Amino acid sequence: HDSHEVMQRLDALLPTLRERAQETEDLRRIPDDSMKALQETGFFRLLQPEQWGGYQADPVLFYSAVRKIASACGSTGWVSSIIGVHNWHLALFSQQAQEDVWGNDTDVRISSSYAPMGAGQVVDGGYTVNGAWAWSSGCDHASWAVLGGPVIKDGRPVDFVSFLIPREDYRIDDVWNVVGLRGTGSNTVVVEDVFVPTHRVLSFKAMSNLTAPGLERNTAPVYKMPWGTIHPTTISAPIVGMAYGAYDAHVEHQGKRVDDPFAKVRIAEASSDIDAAWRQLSGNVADEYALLVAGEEVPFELRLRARRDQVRATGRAISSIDKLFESSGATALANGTPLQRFWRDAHAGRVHAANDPERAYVMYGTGEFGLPITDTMV
Amino acid sequence: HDSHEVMQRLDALLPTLRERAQETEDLRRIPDDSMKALQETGFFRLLQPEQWGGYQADPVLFYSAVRKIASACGSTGWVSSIIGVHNWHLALFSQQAQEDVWGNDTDVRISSSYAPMGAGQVVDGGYTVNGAWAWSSGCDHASWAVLGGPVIKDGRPVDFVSFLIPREDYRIDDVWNVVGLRGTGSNTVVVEDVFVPTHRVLSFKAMSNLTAPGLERNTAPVYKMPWGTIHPTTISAPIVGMAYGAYDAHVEHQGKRVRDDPFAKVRIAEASSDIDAAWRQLSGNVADEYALLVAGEEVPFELRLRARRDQVRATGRAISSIDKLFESSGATALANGTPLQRFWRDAHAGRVHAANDPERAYVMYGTGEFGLPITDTMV
Amino acid sequence: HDSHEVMQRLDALLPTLRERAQETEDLRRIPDDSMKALQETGFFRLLQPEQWGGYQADPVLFYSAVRKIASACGSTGWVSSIIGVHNWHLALFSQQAQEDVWGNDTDVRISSSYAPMGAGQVVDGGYTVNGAWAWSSGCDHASWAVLGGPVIKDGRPVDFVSFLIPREDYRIDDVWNVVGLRGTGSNTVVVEDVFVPTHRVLSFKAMSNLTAPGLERNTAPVYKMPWGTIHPTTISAPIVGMAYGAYDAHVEHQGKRVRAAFAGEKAKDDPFAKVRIAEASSDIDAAWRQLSGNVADEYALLVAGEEVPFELRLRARRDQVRATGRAISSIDKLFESSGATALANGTPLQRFWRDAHAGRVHAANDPERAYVMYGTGEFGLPITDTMV
Amino acid sequence: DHDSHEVMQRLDALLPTLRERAQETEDLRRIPDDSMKALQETGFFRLLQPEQWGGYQADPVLFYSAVRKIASACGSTGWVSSIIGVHNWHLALFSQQAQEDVWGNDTDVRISSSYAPMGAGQVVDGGYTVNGAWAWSSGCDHASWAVLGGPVIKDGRPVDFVSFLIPREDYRIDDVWNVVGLRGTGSNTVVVEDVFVPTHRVLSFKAMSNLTAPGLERNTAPVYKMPWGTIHPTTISAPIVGMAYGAYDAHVEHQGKRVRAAFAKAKDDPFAKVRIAEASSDIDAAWRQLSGNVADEYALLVAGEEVPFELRLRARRDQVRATGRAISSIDKLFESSGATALANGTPLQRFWRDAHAGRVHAANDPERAYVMYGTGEFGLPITDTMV
C-alpha cells in the first residue's frame, strides 16, 4: 500500500503533523490547516463510495493510512481514523441521506458518538431526538453527526440505531479537559427536541443483516465488512500507529545518546510486540476482505478472532509504549516532547469501549466452546 | 506508629492536601501554606536530632508519615520525604555545620541534589565549588542545599562528598516543566566559584565507615542507618504512598458505580495485595536494620542488599498497581483535576530517580548471592 | 521461631529429606522412616491440643515448620502440612471423637479429602456414608480420615460436614499417577455403606459459628482461627517452602558455576541471571511476609480476646492465593534461567518445579475465586462463598 | 496454499497415530522406528533436500509448516523431524563429493547434528583429526552420519568454526538421554576419538555466510541461499510453536466438552475463556512473525535480491520471542486446566514439559537475540554470528 497516491501524499505531510503536535495538544483541537491538508491527500475519501468521488478502498489501505498519521500525531491519527470511518458508515444509510450530506460537496465530514447518550421517540415521518452525546472526536471539523441510541415507541426501546443530524440542529459544548488525546477535541453534541426523518436513521441490526439500504447502490465489497471489525479496528489502528511513532522517537533519541543491555532488550520487546499487533490487526481485516471479494460471507469464527486480536493489538501497543517510556527515564518527563505525549495519548485511547479486552476475550472463548453469543460488538 | 502525635496531626491535614492537589501541580512547587502546615505538625522534626528539638525517630515512623502524606498529594509527599531526610543527613555533619544551619532557627530546611553535577576544588580552609545541580525537589522551600560531587585535587577525584551551601551563595533556576510530580518544584541549584569551608563538607565514605563526625553528639541509633537504605527508601516510600491514595480513590469511586464485572474486582485484589507487599518489604527491611542498631549490633551486608532489592521492587509494585487501577477505571479517570490520573503521572515521574533504577539493585543483589565483589556504593 | 525445639529437630532432619527426594518420587509415597522421624521431632503435635500432649502452638510456628520441611522435599512438605493441620481440625470435634482417635495413642494421624466426593444419609445414631474421596495426601500414613461431604436428609443436602472414619472402615485405592507431587501418595479413600456416629461428624457451619464442641475443653486461641485462613494457608505454605528450596538449590549450583567460571565466560558476568535471582528471592519473601503476616494478625487479635474481622479474613484469602502464585512464578523464573542443566531427571530444581505446579491445582489455590470475593467485599456487596 | 502440498496431506494422515503413540515415544526415550519410517514415506525429509538427490528443495515456509504440524501431534517427534530435516538443507551446502558420500547410493540417508562446540579438529594433511563428545544430538539413533560443530585447530589456536561430517562407522552413540521433557527425542551423545575427516567433508560457517559454500554451484535453488541465523534457530522455534498449537487444540477439545455438558464452575467461567483468548492470540502472533520473516527472506532470494541484515536481525528478535509466546501460552492453558491436566500420559502436561525442555536450546536464549537487535538499532557493531 505504500505506493498508493494517498500514502505518498501523507508521507509528505508527516513532518508538519509532528511539528504541530504540541500546538494541537495546547489548543485541544486538530488545527484546521492539518484537516485541510489531510483532505487534500484524499485520505477522507478512502472509504467513501465511488458515486461520491471516493476510493471505496481495500480497508487495509485505510488502516495503513491511519497507522501512518497516528505515528506523527496521536490526536490527529485518532480523529483521522474516526472521521474517516464515518464515510464508510454513511455509505450504508439510504441514498437520500448520502445525498443530503454529499449532494453539493463531497468533502463534507461527519463526527459521531455511538454510545447511547440520547434517544429518538417515534413521531410522524421519523423521530424526535434528545441527548447529550459526549466524546465526539473531531466534532468541530464536521457538519453532521451520527449519534447512537435506542428508538422509543409506546414507552419501550424497539431498535438501536444511529441518527444522522446536521450541525444546524445541534450545539457543541466545549468540555474536553483530559490527560491524553487532548488534541482530539472530543466535545459533546447536544441535541434538544430535534426532528430526524426516517431516511436519516440506520439500525445496527439492518447493517448486520446485510440489509442496510445503502448497499443497493454502494455495492463495493468493503461495505459488506462487519461493523464489529470495522469500528473497533478504527480505534486500535491509531493506537498501534502511536506505538510506531513512540518507538521511532525513542530509538532516535537513545541512539544518539548511546553498556546497557536492558535498554536494548526493551527495544527488542517493544518493536516485536508492535509488529505482532499490526500483523494481527491488519491480517484479520485482510482475511475478511479477501472472503468478501471472493463473494463469500465472513465466517463468525473470523469475526471472533478479529475482536480477540484487535483488543490485544491495543494492549501490545500500550505495553510497548510503556516499556519505552520507562526505559527512557528522566529525559522523557519533559513537557512538549514526543514520547510522554504518545504515552498519555495511547492510555487515553485505551478507555474506548471497543478496547475493553475482557469483553472480546470472553466472547472469543464462548465461541471456542460453541456456546451462544449475544454481544453485538463482533 | 499511627498514634504518634505527628501522625495524628498529619491525619488532620490530609483533606486539605487532597483538596489542593491540583493547585499544587499548577503552581509547580509546594504552596507555602502546605509547607507551613507540615512544619507545624512536627513532621520535619522527625529525623532531626534531639539537640535541635527533633524526635530522632524510629525510621519506620518517618516513612509511615511520608506514606500518609503522599497518599493525599504525590508532589507534597515526594517533597516531604526528601526535605525531611536531609535533617537526618545534616545530623551526620560536624557540630559546627549543624550550628550554622540550626543555631538560630531549628525549623530551617535543607534541599539536595546528590548526583555529581558539580565539584569542589581543594583550597586553603575548604573548597571552591562550581556546578549546576538539577532536580532539587522542594529547593524553593529551603535555605541551604547539600550537593553531591567529587573533591578535585591535583586534577584527580580524591573523595565523593556533600557540600553544604547556604542559599545566599547559590541561584535557583525555575526550569521545572514535566509530565508528573509537577508540584515538586525540582529546580536547579546553580553554584559559581563559591567557597565552602571544610567543616561543611561530609564524605559519603566517612558515613559508610560509621565515622561521620555528627555521630559523636547525635548518638541515637537512627543516625547509624546505612545511606543505601535511608536515601533510596526516601524515594520509594512516597510512591508506595501514592499507590495507597490511588487505590482508596479508585475503590471509593468504583464502589459507588458498582452499587456484574469480576475483572474490576480482580484488578483491585491484585493491586491491593501488591501495594501491601511493597510496604511490608520496604518498611520491614528498615525495621530489621533499625532493630539491630537499637540492640547495639551491626547491620549485616546481606540485609543491606535485600533492602535495595526490595526497595526498587516496592517502587515497581506500586507503579504496576497504579497502572492496573488507572486502566480499570477507564474513561472517567482521564478527566483533568481528578486524583487517579495525577497519582499515575506522579508515580511514573518518581520512577525516574536514580535510586529507583531496578536492574542496578537487582544485579548487585545477584552478585552478592554469588559471593562476587561489589563496588556499587548505593547499598 | 528457629530456636523452638521442633524447628531445631527439623533442621537436623532436612539433609535426610533432601537425600530421599528422588526415592520418595519413585515410590509415590513418603517413606515410613521419614514420617517416623517427623513424628519424633514433635512436628505433628504442633497444632494438637495440650490435653493430648500437643503444643497447641502459635499457627505461625506451624506454617514455619511446614515451610522448612517443604524446602527439602516438596511431597514431604505437602503431606506434613495437611496431616499436621488435621490435628487442629480434630481439636474442634467432640471430646468423644478425640478420645476415639487419641485415647490410647496420641501419635495417631488422620488424612483427609475435603472436596465433596461422598455423602452421609441421616440414620438413627448418625449417618450412612458412601463415597470415593480422591487426593487424600499421605493417606497410607494415617489410621483415620476426615472426609468432606453433604448430609442427606429427606434426600436433600442440608449441611456440609466432615465425617471422621477409622481405617478399618475404608479401603485405599492406589491411583496416584501424576506429573508432580508424585511422592505424596494422594490416593483414594473408598467408603461403602459405613455407619458414622453423630459424635464423629462436624459441621463447617458450627466451626464458623464458634460452636464446635471441641472448643469447650480445647480453649487455646489457635482453635478459634478461621478455617478459611487455616486450611488454604496449609496449602500455600508448602508451595512457598518449595520456592525457598528451589531458590537455594539454584543459587548453590549457579554460585559454584559463576565462581569457577573464567574472566570472559557468559556465566561470570550474566546480569540477566542475577536479575532473575533478585526477582525470585524478593517475590518469595513477599509471599511469605503476607502469608505468615495475615496469620499472625488474626492470631494476635484472638490472643487479645477479639474477633477476627471479616475484612482481615478477606485479605488473608487474597494474599494466600497470591503467595502460591508468587512462589510458582519465582520457581518458573529460576528453572527457566538454569536452562539445560535443570532438565536432568533426579535433580532438585525440576522436581520443585513440577511439584509446585501440581500443588497449584488445589481448590484453595484458585486465585480468581479469592480475588473476586475480595473485590466484592471492597465494593460492599454480598458474599456467599464460604472459603473465607 | 501449503496445506494442499502432497507432503502436508500425507502428514495429516499420520497425526492420529503420532498422538496415540506420544506416551510410548517418551517411554522409549527415542523416536520409534515406525514413526521415522512413516515420516520418511510422506516425503517429509526430502522437503529441503536438493532436487539432484530426489528432493523438493522447497519453499522453507512449507518445511516449517510441516514441522509445525508434526510437533502439534507429538512434541518429541516434531523436534526430531525439524532438526533431522534441516540437516538435508545443511548438507546441500557441502561439496558435491560430500553429498555423494552420503546420498550416492541411498537418497533416504539421514544425518544428525550437534552444533555447539563440544570437540575440535586439528589440521593434518588431507583434512583434520577430530576428537569430541557432542551431546544433545536429537534423533542421532536414526541417522548414519553426523555434522558436528567445532573449531579448526592450527598451530594450537582456533582459526575457523566449521561442521565436520562424519559417518556412523567412525563414532559411538552413548545412550545418556534422561530428562524431564522432550524425552522421546533420544538426544544422545556422539563420541569421536582420533578420527580422520577429509577436507571435502568440512564446511566453514563463514563460507556459508559469504555465499561461497561449494554446494551452491550445483544446488542453485534459492532456499540454499537463506541465512543460517534464520534457518537453524527457526528449526528450533517452529516445533515449539507447533507444540503450542497442539496444546491449544487438546485443551479446547477437552474443555469444550466439559462446558457444553455443564449445568447451572464450567458453565460460566470467564477466566478460562480469557486464558483461551490470550493463548490462541499469542500462538498466532508467534507463527505470523516466525513464518513471516522466513517468507520475506525467501521472497527476496526468489527475486534474485539480497537479504538485508536488518531483516536477519528482526528474524532473530521474533524467533526467540515466538518460542517465548508459545511457552507462555502453553503455561496459561496448563494452569487453567488444573487438576485434570496433572494425569500422566495425557497430552497437555506433555506439551508443557516438552516446550520447557526445547526452551533450553542455545538458539532460544532470548536476551542473546534481543541485545543483538538493540545493538543494531543503535547502529553499533555486532560480532555475534547467530544472525
mmCIF file with all atom_site columns, C-alpha atoms in Angstrom, chain A residues 138-246:
data_model
loop_
_atom_site.group_PDB
_atom_site.id
_atom_site.type_symbol
_atom_site.label_atom_id
_atom_site.label_alt_id
_atom_site.label_comp_id
_atom_site.label_asym_id
_atom_site.label_entity_id
_atom_site.label_seq_id
_atom_site.pdbx_PDB_ins_code
_atom_site.Cartn_x
_atom_site.Cartn_y
_atom_site.Cartn_z
_atom_site.occupancy
_atom_site.B_iso_or_equiv
_atom_site.pdbx_formal_charge
_atom_site.auth_seq_id
_atom_site.auth_comp_id
_atom_site.auth_asym_id
_atom_site.auth_atom_id
_atom_site.pdbx_PDB_model_num
ATOM 1   C CA . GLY A 1 138 ? -13.074 15.966 15.871 1.00 0.00 ? 138 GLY A CA 1
ATOM 2   C CA . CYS A 1 139 ? -16.667 17.201 16.046 1.00 0.00 ? 139 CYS A CA 1
ATOM 3   C CA . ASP A 1 140 ? -15.624 20.798 15.264 1.00 0.00 ? 140 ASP A CA 1
ATOM 4   C CA . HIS A 1 141 ? -14.367 19.576 11.854 1.00 0.00 ? 141 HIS A CA 1
ATOM 5   C CA . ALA A 1 142 ? -17.708 18.072 10.799 1.00 0.00 ? 142 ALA A CA 1
ATOM 6   C CA . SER A 1 143 ? -21.028 19.473 9.715  1.00 0.00 ? 143 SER A CA 1
ATOM 7   C CA . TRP A 1 144 ? -23.108 16.359 10.544 1.00 0.00 ? 144 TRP A CA 1
ATOM 8   C CA . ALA A 1 145 ? -23.105 13.813 13.342 1.00 0.00 ? 145 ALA A CA 1
ATOM 9   C CA . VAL A 1 146 ? -24.136 10.183 13.607 1.00 0.00 ? 146 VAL A CA 1
ATOM 10  C CA . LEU A 1 147 ? -25.426 9.550  17.115 1.00 0.00 ? 147 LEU A CA 1
ATOM 11  C CA . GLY A 1 148 ? -26.189 6.140  18.635 1.00 0.00 ? 148 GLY A CA 1
ATOM 12  C CA . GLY A 1 149 ? -29.270 5.425  20.689 1.00 0.00 ? 149 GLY A CA 1
ATOM 13  C CA . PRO A 1 150 ? -32.491 3.495  21.113 1.00 0.00 ? 150 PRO A CA 1
ATOM 14  C CA . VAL A 1 151 ? -35.734 4.193  19.232 1.00 0.00 ? 151 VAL A CA 1
ATOM 15  C CA . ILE A 1 152 ? -38.608 4.529  21.707 1.00 0.00 ? 152 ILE A CA 1
ATOM 16  C CA . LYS A 1 153 ? -42.125 3.544  20.696 1.00 0.00 ? 153 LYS A CA 1
ATOM 17  C CA . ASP A 1 154 ? -45.019 3.369  23.168 1.00 0.00 ? 154 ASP A CA 1
ATOM 18  C CA . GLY A 1 155 ? -42.565 3.747  26.043 1.00 0.00 ? 155 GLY A CA 1
ATOM 19  C CA . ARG A 1 156 ? -40.203 0.882  25.141 1.00 0.00 ? 156 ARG A CA 1
ATOM 20  C CA . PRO A 1 157 ? -36.952 0.553  23.116 1.00 0.00 ? 157 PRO A CA 1
ATOM 21  C CA . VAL A 1 158 ? -37.703 -1.150 19.778 1.00 0.00 ? 158 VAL A CA 1
ATOM 22  C CA . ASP A 1 159 ? -34.476 -0.614 17.856 1.00 0.00 ? 159 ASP A CA 1
ATOM 23  C CA . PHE A 1 160 ? -30.927 0.594  18.274 1.00 0.00 ? 160 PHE A CA 1
ATOM 24  C CA . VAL A 1 161 ? -29.847 2.999  15.568 1.00 0.00 ? 161 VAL A CA 1
ATOM 25  C CA . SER A 1 162 ? -27.656 5.884  14.518 1.00 0.00 ? 162 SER A CA 1
ATOM 26  C CA . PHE A 1 163 ? -29.422 9.188  13.930 1.00 0.00 ? 163 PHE A CA 1
ATOM 27  C CA . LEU A 1 164 ? -27.833 11.408 11.270 1.00 0.00 ? 164 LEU A CA 1
ATOM 28  C CA . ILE A 1 165 ? -28.216 15.079 12.281 1.00 0.00 ? 165 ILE A CA 1
ATOM 29  C CA . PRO A 1 166 ? -26.870 18.247 10.612 1.00 0.00 ? 166 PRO A CA 1
ATOM 30  C CA . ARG A 1 167 ? -24.855 20.699 12.674 1.00 0.00 ? 167 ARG A CA 1
ATOM 31  C CA . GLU A 1 168 ? -27.545 23.407 12.330 1.00 0.00 ? 168 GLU A CA 1
ATOM 32  C CA . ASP A 1 169 ? -29.629 21.205 14.673 1.00 0.00 ? 169 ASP A CA 1
ATOM 33  C CA . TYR A 1 170 ? -27.075 20.645 17.444 1.00 0.00 ? 170 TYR A CA 1
ATOM 34  C CA . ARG A 1 171 ? -24.743 22.534 19.765 1.00 0.00 ? 171 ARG A CA 1
ATOM 35  C CA . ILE A 1 172 ? -21.168 21.520 20.595 1.00 0.00 ? 172 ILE A CA 1
ATOM 36  C CA . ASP A 1 173 ? -20.212 22.049 24.239 1.00 0.00 ? 173 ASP A CA 1
ATOM 37  C CA . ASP A 1 174 ? -16.503 22.501 24.899 1.00 0.00 ? 174 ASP A CA 1
ATOM 38  C CA . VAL A 1 175 ? -15.822 20.153 27.844 1.00 0.00 ? 175 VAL A CA 1
ATOM 39  C CA . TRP A 1 176 ? -12.680 18.343 26.600 1.00 0.00 ? 176 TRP A CA 1
ATOM 40  C CA . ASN A 1 177 ? -10.307 18.514 29.565 1.00 0.00 ? 177 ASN A CA 1
ATOM 41  C CA . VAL A 1 178 ? -8.290  15.273 29.751 1.00 0.00 ? 178 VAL A CA 1
ATOM 42  C CA . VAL A 1 179 ? -4.833  13.782 30.425 1.00 0.00 ? 179 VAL A CA 1
ATOM 43  C CA . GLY A 1 180 ? -4.280  12.477 26.866 1.00 0.00 ? 180 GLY A CA 1
ATOM 44  C CA . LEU A 1 181 ? -5.662  12.773 23.321 1.00 0.00 ? 181 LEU A CA 1
ATOM 45  C CA . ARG A 1 182 ? -6.095  16.433 24.283 1.00 0.00 ? 182 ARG A CA 1
ATOM 46  C CA . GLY A 1 183 ? -5.861  17.486 20.615 1.00 0.00 ? 183 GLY A CA 1
ATOM 47  C CA . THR A 1 184 ? -8.866  15.396 19.604 1.00 0.00 ? 184 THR A CA 1
ATOM 48  C CA . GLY A 1 185 ? -11.455 17.994 20.791 1.00 0.00 ? 185 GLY A CA 1
ATOM 49  C CA . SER A 1 186 ? -13.770 15.136 21.717 1.00 0.00 ? 186 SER A CA 1
ATOM 50  C CA . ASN A 1 187 ? -16.543 17.511 22.763 1.00 0.00 ? 187 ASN A CA 1
ATOM 51  C CA . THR A 1 188 ? -20.245 16.972 23.475 1.00 0.00 ? 188 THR A CA 1
ATOM 52  C CA . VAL A 1 189 ? -23.011 17.112 20.858 1.00 0.00 ? 189 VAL A CA 1
ATOM 53  C CA . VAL A 1 190 ? -26.168 18.427 22.476 1.00 0.00 ? 190 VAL A CA 1
ATOM 54  C CA . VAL A 1 191 ? -29.488 17.690 20.770 1.00 0.00 ? 191 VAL A CA 1
ATOM 55  C CA . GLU A 1 192 ? -32.743 19.216 22.039 1.00 0.00 ? 192 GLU A CA 1
ATOM 56  C CA . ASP A 1 193 ? -36.181 18.302 20.642 1.00 0.00 ? 193 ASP A CA 1
ATOM 57  C CA . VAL A 1 194 ? -34.788 17.672 17.168 1.00 0.00 ? 194 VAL A CA 1
ATOM 58  C CA . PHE A 1 195 ? -36.762 16.061 14.317 1.00 0.00 ? 195 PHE A CA 1
ATOM 59  C CA . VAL A 1 196 ? -34.795 13.447 12.413 1.00 0.00 ? 196 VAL A CA 1
ATOM 60  C CA . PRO A 1 197 ? -36.554 11.997 9.319  1.00 0.00 ? 197 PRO A CA 1
ATOM 61  C CA . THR A 1 198 ? -36.718 8.231  8.793  1.00 0.00 ? 198 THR A CA 1
ATOM 62  C CA . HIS A 1 199 ? -34.325 8.278  5.810  1.00 0.00 ? 199 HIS A CA 1
ATOM 63  C CA . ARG A 1 200 ? -31.625 9.673  8.111  1.00 0.00 ? 200 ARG A CA 1
ATOM 64  C CA . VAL A 1 201 ? -31.770 6.767  10.552 1.00 0.00 ? 201 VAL A CA 1
ATOM 65  C CA . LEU A 1 202 ? -29.966 3.428  10.292 1.00 0.00 ? 202 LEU A CA 1
ATOM 66  C CA . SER A 1 203 ? -30.480 0.417  12.540 1.00 0.00 ? 203 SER A CA 1
ATOM 67  C CA . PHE A 1 204 ? -27.369 -1.540 13.509 1.00 0.00 ? 204 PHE A CA 1
ATOM 68  C CA . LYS A 1 205 ? -29.457 -4.698 13.025 1.00 0.00 ? 205 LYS A CA 1
ATOM 69  C CA . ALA A 1 206 ? -30.081 -3.772 9.365  1.00 0.00 ? 206 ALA A CA 1
ATOM 70  C CA . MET A 1 207 ? -26.335 -3.414 8.993  1.00 0.00 ? 207 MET A CA 1
ATOM 71  C CA . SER A 1 208 ? -25.554 -6.824 10.479 1.00 0.00 ? 208 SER A CA 1
ATOM 72  C CA . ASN A 1 209 ? -28.393 -8.402 8.467  1.00 0.00 ? 209 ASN A CA 1
ATOM 73  C CA . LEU A 1 210 ? -26.677 -7.073 5.316  1.00 0.00 ? 210 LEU A CA 1
ATOM 74  C CA . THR A 1 211 ? -29.911 -5.205 4.555  1.00 0.00 ? 211 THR A CA 1
ATOM 75  C CA . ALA A 1 212 ? -28.704 -1.599 5.050  1.00 0.00 ? 212 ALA A CA 1
ATOM 76  C CA . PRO A 1 213 ? -30.342 0.426  2.236  1.00 0.00 ? 213 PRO A CA 1
ATOM 77  C CA . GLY A 1 214 ? -27.037 1.963  1.136  1.00 0.00 ? 214 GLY A CA 1
ATOM 78  C CA . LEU A 1 215 ? -25.877 -1.443 -0.115 1.00 0.00 ? 215 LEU A CA 1
ATOM 79  C CA . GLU A 1 216 ? -28.253 -1.321 -3.087 1.00 0.00 ? 216 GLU A CA 1
ATOM 80  C CA . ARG A 1 217 ? -26.162 1.329  -4.873 1.00 0.00 ? 217 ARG A CA 1
ATOM 81  C CA . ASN A 1 218 ? -22.913 1.050  -2.894 1.00 0.00 ? 218 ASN A CA 1
ATOM 82  C CA . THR A 1 219 ? -22.102 -2.483 -3.974 1.00 0.00 ? 219 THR A CA 1
ATOM 83  C CA . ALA A 1 220 ? -18.308 -2.464 -3.305 1.00 0.00 ? 220 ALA A CA 1
ATOM 84  C CA . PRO A 1 221 ? -17.119 -5.377 -1.132 1.00 0.00 ? 221 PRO A CA 1
ATOM 85  C CA . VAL A 1 222 ? -15.713 -3.069 1.564  1.00 0.00 ? 222 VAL A CA 1
ATOM 86  C CA . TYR A 1 223 ? -19.295 -2.096 2.561  1.00 0.00 ? 223 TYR A CA 1
ATOM 87  C CA . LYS A 1 224 ? -20.107 -5.700 3.460  1.00 0.00 ? 224 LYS A CA 1
ATOM 88  C CA . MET A 1 225 ? -17.382 -5.737 6.194  1.00 0.00 ? 225 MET A CA 1
ATOM 89  C CA . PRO A 1 226 ? -18.701 -6.415 9.722  1.00 0.00 ? 226 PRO A CA 1
ATOM 90  C CA . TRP A 1 227 ? -19.073 -3.318 11.922 1.00 0.00 ? 227 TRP A CA 1
ATOM 91  C CA . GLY A 1 228 ? -17.639 -5.360 14.820 1.00 0.00 ? 228 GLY A CA 1
ATOM 92  C CA . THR A 1 229 ? -14.328 -5.433 12.909 1.00 0.00 ? 229 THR A CA 1
ATOM 93  C CA . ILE A 1 230 ? -14.546 -2.058 11.111 1.00 0.00 ? 230 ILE A CA 1
ATOM 94  C CA . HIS A 1 231 ? -15.297 0.166  14.098 1.00 0.00 ? 231 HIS A CA 1
ATOM 95  C CA . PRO A 1 232 ? -13.059 -1.418 16.781 1.00 0.00 ? 232 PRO A CA 1
ATOM 96  C CA . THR A 1 233 ? -10.164 -1.611 14.268 1.00 0.00 ? 233 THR A CA 1
ATOM 97  C CA . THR A 1 234 ? -10.574 2.193  13.720 1.00 0.00 ? 234 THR A CA 1
ATOM 98  C CA . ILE A 1 235 ? -9.975  2.545  17.453 1.00 0.00 ? 235 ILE A CA 1
ATOM 99  C CA . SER A 1 236 ? -6.955  0.197  17.666 1.00 0.00 ? 236 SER A CA 1
ATOM 100 C CA . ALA A 1 237 ? -5.173  1.261  14.460 1.00 0.00 ? 237 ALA A CA 1
ATOM 101 C CA . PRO A 1 238 ? -4.270  4.770  15.687 1.00 0.00 ? 238 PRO A CA 1
ATOM 102 C CA . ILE A 1 239 ? -3.019  3.373  18.997 1.00 0.00 ? 239 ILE A CA 1
ATOM 103 C CA . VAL A 1 240 ? -0.748  0.936  17.108 1.00 0.00 ? 240 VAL A CA 1
ATOM 104 C CA . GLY A 1 241 ? 0.380   3.918  14.975 1.00 0.00 ? 241 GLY A CA 1
ATOM 105 C CA . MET A 1 242 ? 1.197   5.851  18.176 1.00 0.00 ? 242 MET A CA 1
ATOM 106 C CA . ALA A 1 243 ? 3.384   2.954  19.246 1.00 0.00 ? 243 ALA A CA 1
ATOM 107 C CA . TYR A 1 244 ? 5.339   3.110  15.957 1.00 0.00 ? 244 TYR A CA 1
ATOM 108 C CA . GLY A 1 245 ? 5.852   6.852  16.425 1.00 0.00 ? 245 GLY A CA 1
ATOM 109 C CA . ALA A 1 246 ? 6.901   6.331  20.061 1.00 0.00 ? 246 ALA A CA 1
#
